[PDB]
Design a protein around this ligand. Structure first.
Ligand code: NA
Length: 129
């Protein structure tokens, strides 16, 4: 599913991301825009042989099992295909473990390079929240 911006903001707020570990909702919408273009089906192979999955590009080296990332962890205890669903529950629950892991939202390279330190409140402008 390709989300609209305010559609995704509403879903991420519904599931508890707004101000989670002190990251305002616009940080999460910005991250999803530049990680996945708001597409739950997005996949991207990494040079280490892992893959990033879904709306928040969650990595198979640490967080999910994709059957082809040797020696990798599965800390969210889910198949990586679960992170491609139109239902973002699994992605959000896993993102909450990732952002709690020690480096905060710096786990999302697109957030660090394109959202961090910017006017992230612009990403929820005009949305009914
Ligand atoms: Na894995």
């Amino acid at each position: 599913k390709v989300f609209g911006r305010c559609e995704l903001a509403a879903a991420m707020k519904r599931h508890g991301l707004d101000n989670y570990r002190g990251y305002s909702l616009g940080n999460w919408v910005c991250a999803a825009k530049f990680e996945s273009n708001f597409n739950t089906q997005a996949t991207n192979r990494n040079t280490d042989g892992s893959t990033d999955y879904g709306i928040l590009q969650i990595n198979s080296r640490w967080w999910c099992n994709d059957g082809r990332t040797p020696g990798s962890r599965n800390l969210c205890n889910i198949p990586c295909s679960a992170l491609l669903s139109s239902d973002i529950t699994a992605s959000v629950n896993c993102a909450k473990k990732i952002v709690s892991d020690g480096n905060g939202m710096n786990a999302w390279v697109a957030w660090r390079n394109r959202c961090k330190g910017t006017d992230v409140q612009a990403w929820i402008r005009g949305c009914r929240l």
